[PDB]
Amino acid sequence: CSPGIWQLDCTHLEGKVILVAVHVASGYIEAEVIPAETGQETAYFLLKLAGRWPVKTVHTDNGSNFTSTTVKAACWWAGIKQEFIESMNKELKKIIGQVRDQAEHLKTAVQMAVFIHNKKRKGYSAGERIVDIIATDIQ
Amino acid sequence: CSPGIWQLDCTHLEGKVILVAVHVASGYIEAEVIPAETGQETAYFLLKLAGRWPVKTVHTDNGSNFTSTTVKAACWWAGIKQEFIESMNKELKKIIGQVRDQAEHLKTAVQMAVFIHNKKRKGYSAGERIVDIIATDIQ
Ligand SMILES: Cc1nc(NC(=O)NC2CCCCC2)c(C)c([C@H](OC(C)(C)C)C(=O)O)c1-c1ccc2c(c1C)CCCO2
Ligand SMILES: Cc1nc(NC(=O)NC2CCCCC2)c(C)c([C@H](OC(C)(C)C)C(=O)O)c1-c1ccc2c(c1C)CCCO2
């Protein structure tokens, strides 16, 4: 429940890679579809995320993801430390499946799924919860 | 100062296109580097943004950006309406210039610049302000 904790993983769909970030306290996510499951992709993603949110620690279900020099450079620069129960990859995958017919590209469907999950209330939505948590923590 | 208002534009650097989003009330931004300045890129960006934040209206300095069918589809689905003094593209560009030497790719420098701007206090930072504004508006 610490507010600066995020979880990062890659799932595979349609021979494509989806990078999924979860803010643990709230259940909010960001995701992107990447061409390849490399360290460079992760590092860049981390950079984007850190600029957006106050990211203090990151946990992953695959430790080897975080061994690249590039990833380390990103965590060093942005001041992120590594951390050593979702499972929203299933839920996200579920939502992607429902809307997949709607879009040509997998990435579009993924973004649609992110939108639905973050928005849905079950009574704040995750999108509401993350702002509430972060703002409160600020003062 | 309405909390759901965002501003979207493209600047050019190094023969590359940067899409920049500003949350007007706070000065917070998100940016991406895109290959080409197309409607499809914008639509996809909008989707990502809308999932992340509560986006009610979007203004741009180039109205023709928003004429593509693809963009319209994105605004329709996410419930965004069009809206008809930054100028942070200069400031962002300024920051990109300072750090450009640090990275090989322009995109990395851009993300670095986003991070610096959102973080900097001058006394909340923009990153703080956007959460404060959105959370407050929620209750
Ligand atoms: C509306 C839309 N179109 C395309 N591609 C097209 O060829 N569209 C032409 C537009 C002129 C008239 C004939 C059809 C695509 C590719 C998309 C989506 O792709 C992007 C990258 C643009 C998001 C897609 O993957 O389906 C869309 C589109 C755009 C936004 C959007 C949705 C779609 C289908 C679905 C709902 C969420 O918002
Ligand atoms: C550290 C880093 N490296 C590369 N590329 C490499 O070839 N790195 C190898 C790593 C093994 C030992 C020799 C050097 C790149 C391209 C980057 C940046 O690119 C990505 C896409 C990975 C972000 C870059 O554009 O410079 C970096 C890198 C990664 C993170 C990072 C920074 C850099 C330079 C700069 C500070 C912010 O965080």
Q: What is the 3-state secondary structure of chain A?
A: CCCCEEEEEEEEECCEEEEEEEECCCCEEEEEEECCCCHHHHHHHHHHHHHHCCCCEEECCCHHHHHCHHHHHHHHHHCCEECCCCCHHHHHHHHHHHHHHHCCCHHHHHHHHHHHHHHCECCCEHHHHHHHHHHHHHC
Give whole-number Cα distances, B109 to A113, B62, B130, in Å.
29, 25, 23
Six-digit token string for A109? 């469907």
User: Nearest by CB to B134, which of A107, A114, A131?
Assistant: A131
Q: Does A129 touch chain B (CB under 8 A)?
A: no
In Å, how far is A126's CA from the nearest CA of chain B? 10
φ/ψ of residue A22, rounded to 5: -120, 130
Q: Is B11 strand, coil or helix? A: strand
Residue A80's Cβ-count burial label (10 Å; 0-12, 13-18, 19+) is buried
DSSP state of B79: T
Range 69-108 of A in CB contact (< 8 A) with B: 77-78, 107-108
Domains of chain B: 2-139 (3.30.420.10)
Q: How far is B64 from chain A (nearest CA, A)?
A: 23
Say which amino acid occupies B101.
D
CA of A61 vs chain B CAs: smallest distance (Å): 24
- Distance, CA of A8 to CA of A57 (rounded, Å): 10
**A39/A43 Cα distance (integer angstroms):** 6
H-type helices in chain B, by residue range? Answer: 39-52, 69-78, 88-99, 106-119, 126-138
- Burial bucket for residue A85 (CB in 10 Å: 0-12, 13-18, 19+): exposed
Measured between CA atoms, the residue of chain A closest to residue B138 is A128
Q: How far is CA A69 from CA A32, A40, B69, in A?
A: 21, 9, 42
Ligand 2 centroid distance, CA of A70 (Å): 5
- CA B34 – ligand 1 centroid, Å: 17
Distance from C-alpha of A128 to C-alpha of A91, rounded to nearest angstrom: 19
Determine the residue among B76, B80, B115, B133 to mutate to test chain A binding: the one whose Cβ has the most chain A Cβ atoms within 10 Å: B115
Structure tokens at A31: 């995701």
Residues 19-48 of A with CB under 8 A from B: 30, 44, 47-48
Residue A58 contacts residue A7 (beta carbons within 8 Å)? yes
Which phi and psi (to 5°) does residue B55 adopt? Answer: -110, 115
Quick check: B52 and A30 CB within 8 A? yes
Distance B70 CA to ligand 1 centre (A): 5
* Residues of chain B contacting A103 with CB distance shorter than 8 Å: none
Q: Whose CA is nearest to atom 4 of ligand 2?
A: A70
Beta bridge partners of B121: B125
Instruction: Specify the resolution in Å.
Output: 2.4
DSSP code at position B61: S
**Distance between CA atoms of residues B82 and B66, nearest Å:** 8
Q: Is B122 exposed, middle or buried (0-12, 13-18, 19+ CB in 10 A)?
A: exposed
Closest residue by Cα to residue B49 from B74, B70, B67, B73: B74
Ligand 1 lined by B50 (C-beta under 6 Å)? no
The residue of chain B nearest to residue A134, with distances taken between CA atoms, is: B131
Longest dimension (CA), chain B: 45
Work out the number of other CB atoms within 10 angstroms of the CB of residue B41: 19
